[PDB]
Ligand binder design. Structure first.
Ligand code: TJY
Length: 160
C-alpha cells in the first residue's frame, strides 16, 4: 500500500528508485538541492532544460532524474505561479507513472530561492498530494528544516 513519508536529509542520499530535481528552466547546475543533485548525477544534466511548469526525465545510467521546474514566485503573480506549481507536480506524476518506479524522492518545489520570500510549505505540499495521489509509488518528501519536517509529517498523518 503506497505511503507518503518525510525525511530531513540530503535528497542526493535518497533510498528511492528515482529523484526529482528542483530544476531551473535553463537546465543549469544551480545551488541548493540542484547542487548536491548535480554532484551526484551530473550526466543527468545533459539536455535537462525544460520550461517552468514542466518536468523532464534524464537517465543517469538506469537511475531516473526527473528535472521539475517550479515557478520563481519573484517573477510570477500569485495566481499564475500557483498554476505553474500545480502543473510541475502534474508532470512529475506523469514521469513517475511512465518510468514504472515503485518509489520517488521529491522536494517541495518553489519553497526556497523560488519562494518569493514567502512560506509555501502548505501550497507546495498540497499540489504534490493532488498530483501523486493518482500514482502507485511510495513518495518520500525531503526537507532540511526541523519545523518543516514536523509540519509535513502532521499533514501526511492528517489525511490517513
Ligand atoms: O525554491 C525551490 O525549492 C526551487 N524550486 C524549483 O522548482 N526550482 C528551483 C530552481 C533553483 C533553485 C530553487 C528552486
Amino acid at each position: 500500500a503506497p505511503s507518503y513519508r518525510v525525511k530531513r536529509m540530503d535528497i542526493a542520499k535518497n533510498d528511492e528508485e528515482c529523484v526529482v530535481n528542483a530544476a531551473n528552466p535553463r537546465g543549469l547546475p544551480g545551488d541548493g538541492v540542484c547542487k548536491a543533485v548535480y554532484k551526484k548525477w551530473p550526466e543527468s544534466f545533459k539536455n535537462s532544460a525544460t520550461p517552468v511548469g514542466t518536468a523532464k526525465t534524464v537517465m543517469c545510467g538506469t537511475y531516473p532524474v526527473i528535472h521539475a521546474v517550479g515557478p520563481n514566485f519573484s517573477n510570477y503573480s500569485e495566481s499564475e505561479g500557483d498554476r505553474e506549481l500545480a502543473a510541475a507536480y502534474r508532470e512529475v506524476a506523469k514521469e513517475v507513472t511512465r518510468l514504472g518506479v515503485n518509489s520517488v524522492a521529491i522536494p517541495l518545489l518553489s519553497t526556497g530561492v523560488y519562494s518569493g520570500g514567502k512560506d509555501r510549505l502548505t501550497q507546495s505540499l498540497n499540489h504534490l498530494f493532488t498530483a501523486m495521489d493518482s500514482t502507485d509509488a511510495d513518495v518520500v518528501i525531503y526537507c532540511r528544516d526541523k519545523e518543516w519536517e514536523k509540519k509535513i509529517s502532521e499533514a501526511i498523518q492528517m489525511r490517513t
